[PDB]
Write a protein that binds this DNA or RNA. Structure first.
Length: 203
RNA sequence: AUUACUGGGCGUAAAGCGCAUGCAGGUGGUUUGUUAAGUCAGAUGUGAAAGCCCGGGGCUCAACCUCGGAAUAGCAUUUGAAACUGGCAGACUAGAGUACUGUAGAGGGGGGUAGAAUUUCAGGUGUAGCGGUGAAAUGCGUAGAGAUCUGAAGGAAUACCGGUGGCGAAGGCGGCCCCCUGGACAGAUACUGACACUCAGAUGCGAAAGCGUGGGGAGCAAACAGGAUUAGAUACCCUGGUAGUCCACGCCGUAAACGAUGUCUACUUGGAGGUUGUGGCCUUGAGCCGUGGCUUUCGGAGCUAACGCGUUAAGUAGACCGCCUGGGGAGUACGGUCGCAAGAUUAAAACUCAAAUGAAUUGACGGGGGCCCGCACAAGCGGUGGAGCAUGUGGUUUAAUUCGAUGCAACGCGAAGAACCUUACCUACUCUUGACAUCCAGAGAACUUUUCAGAGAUGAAUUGGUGCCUUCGGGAACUCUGAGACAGGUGCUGCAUGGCUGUCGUCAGCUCGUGUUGUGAAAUGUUGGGUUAAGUCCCGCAACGAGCGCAACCCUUAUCCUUGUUUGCCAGCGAGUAAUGUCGGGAACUCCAGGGAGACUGCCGGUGAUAAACCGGAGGAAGGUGGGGAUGACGUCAAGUCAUCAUGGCCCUUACGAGUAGGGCUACACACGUGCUACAAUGGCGCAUACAGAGGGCGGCCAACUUGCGAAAGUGAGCGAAUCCCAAAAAGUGCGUCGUAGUCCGGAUUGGAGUCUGCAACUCGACUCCAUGAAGUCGGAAUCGCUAGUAAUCGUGGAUCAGAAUGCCACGG
């Protein structure tokens, strides 16, 4: 039914997670490289609060940026060396703190995901996130947990929204992220939206 | 508190007799006295003991035993009290009734009569219909209907008045007149003196239908007949039509006999009416103000589950009566009574169910109402359905024709491209720690030829190479084998899921907080008056705010400006070429691309509530959202997808895993969906000649040249691209020809000869050439798309891709 919030706003208010020019030949290889890098970094930085891996390719190299809540947990030499291997090009790795990590849709969902994997009440997890966000100064937030909720034999979808989340407004700075809590009943999806205020003036 | 004495009910949940009269009974105004039956107080007798209860006492405690008391709510006798009820004897006039005089009235019974109309009949005129319905038919009519005139005879009912008017106990009562007669009401004075209220049983009255007897019978009409409608039509509709309907006298005794509301009495805010008396005023002028009866409506308190009732109570009380006690069975059976009968009345049980039910709420729905929108219909235009092909689906066939998608919203869909591969299927050959992965141990660098067997997978033989990193038994890494953990599964479940998607529909909705209202579900906001594409906006308003949707923000397209100018441009420039923007040169212009400008109902006029907004105008490239795109609220369909992927569970693990070869998915008696090309002259055919946009391109796009009829092949540039290439626009225009037909339409099919891609085109590719020249002569019912640069038509490019586009995405004319 609904367009991806990051998708529609690419170019308008939402930057790209990959910035490199390639001509068709390279383009598809560069893309597969990036996937391997992301799949690796994500798989290693599971307990490092990872949101967003931005992959530049400055000439014949690969700069990564692990935006993280935990620059401490990030080791970096090994990552740098590992990326450099997969990409097959002299890799850099930069780190960026996610300063307010409970106003980050990716982490917020990852949190709720963890909590639901530890067997927490879905309403409890959902609701705490909403409050933390709206306290830290979210202009709004929605969270929709979908699946077999409390291991129900029928899957349903509950969602809580506080503040505005004006998805049809393109100048709106909405952060979206799907997470998945993998549990004994099945997969449980955690969509999270976080409206951080309309950006007048464009990108 | 579910038999309600304590302590329930009866408008709609079960429950007010249809209405009344009335005996027994119940109850009964005021007052004096008396009596003391009820009542009250006390005494005496009695009310066995045990038990119960309260104090003790005894068993180790307790049960148990036991002492004393209390209790035995009563009854008898007796003595008091005399408020209240009763009795008895008086008294009283407020209740109830009487007399008098008026008043209104479809009150009842009897008799008469009038006018309108219908039907029949008779005669006159007249001539082909009439009648009926959705349409029609039955029917009626030429033997004269229907229509029209006149008359006659009958029966029934009384237009207007006419009324939420009137009268009556209720049922009910309607022209006018008379006769007999009941009740109500008012005024006035006098009277009687509680004579009252209610009523089991009883008695009487009691709509319509029905029943008996005798009449009557116009109209209407159960039944019935015929005609239609329909699948049927024992109906609705039409044409007829009998009992009945009417009268007399009986019978019946029932109705949603309803206000679903017993009768009587008293008390308790109002507003507006109707009707019928009466008094006063000045009738100083139809009136106004009092005072009664009856009646209608709206509402307050109160009441009520609510709806509502609300001085005509469903309020507050009293007297008495009737009646209820879960739903079905059943108001039935049996018995009694009543009836001519029909049947009424009284009135169970077994059994069975866990509900049945009232009111109200939110939705959904309605062949309910109102108001609106969409190419929804209409108006048009071009299609499909018919032909041949292409493509998909079903069916069938097959060893296999993998699997999925199935109304809209599956069927040129997943598949943006099945010869092999793909591939999931089939047949056959092959392997089980495995094709793929981690771990562990040991061995071998990896690799490289070249060779035999085999359909191939693989297996055994054959040579070269044997490097890195150094702890140097070491690093790696790759190859191979062994170990068991494990691997693997396009196996199942989309009804366990995530993610993704279709759909309503880009429809204008969907909601929340707080406040308010309600016992509550909930409502309000969000409704209403306008308005808008829009829950758009404006006013109103117990709502006030807010959120998701709407709109805007984004891309593109219209016009302009500014910056820049090559690979694009060429106005003015000079010089060329067979022509060339060719080339010096130009930065103008087209254009390209970055930044800006512009449209807001901003402006004017009119309209409307001065609102919102609406109608029109100016300017302007653009006008009211300029055009197009993107953007899809909350949800609906356990909608689609476990076969993209992911995933709970399940299942398979020498096989449901894995490798290979050949088949298959392309089969075809056929049906359907979507397409393409046709049927021709607004055309075909040949020749001549013109104007695009967009896009793609390196194992790619391929210029030029030569060769070939051609596909192409040689062969050879350029171009990773505003440079080079794909590349030609085609419809158009100009001039011939066909001569309107199966053709100078159409192109299927088939024979034959080839090119190209690929290891390989048999199954099963595209393309070329030669020949062959099928169906088809505009397509039933039905059905689809489209409101403007749209439809229609014309070509052009792209993804997927070795090859393979009538599909799809896109571009212009």
């Amino acid at each position: 039914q609904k367009v991806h919030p990051n998708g529609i706003r690419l170019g308008i208010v939402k930057p790209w997670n990959a910035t490199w020019f390639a001509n068709t030949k390279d383009f598809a290889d560069n893309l597969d490289g990036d996937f391997k890098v992301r799949q690796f970094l994500t798989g290693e930085l599971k307990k490092a609060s990872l949101s967003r891996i931005v992959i530049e390719r400055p000439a014949k190299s690969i700069r990564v940026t692990i935006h993280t809540a935990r620059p401490g947990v990030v080791d970096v030499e090994k990552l740098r060396a590992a990326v450099a291997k997969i990409a097959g090009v002299p890799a850099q790795i930069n780190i960026a703190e996610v300063r307010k990590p409970e106003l980050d849709a990716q982490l917020v969902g990852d949190s709720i995901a963890s909590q639901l994997e530890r067997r927490v009440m879905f309403r409890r997890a959902m609701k705490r996130a909403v409050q933390n966000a709206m306290r830290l100064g979210a202009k709004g937030i929605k969270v929709e947990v979908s699946g077999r909720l409390g291991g129900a034999e029928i899957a349903r979808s509950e969602w809580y929204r506080e503040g505005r989340v004006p998805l049809h407004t393109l100048r709106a700075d909405i952060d979206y992220a799907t997470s998945s809590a993998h549990t004994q009943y099945g997969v449980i999806g955690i969509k999270t939206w976080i409206f951080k205020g309309e950006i007048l003036g464009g990108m």
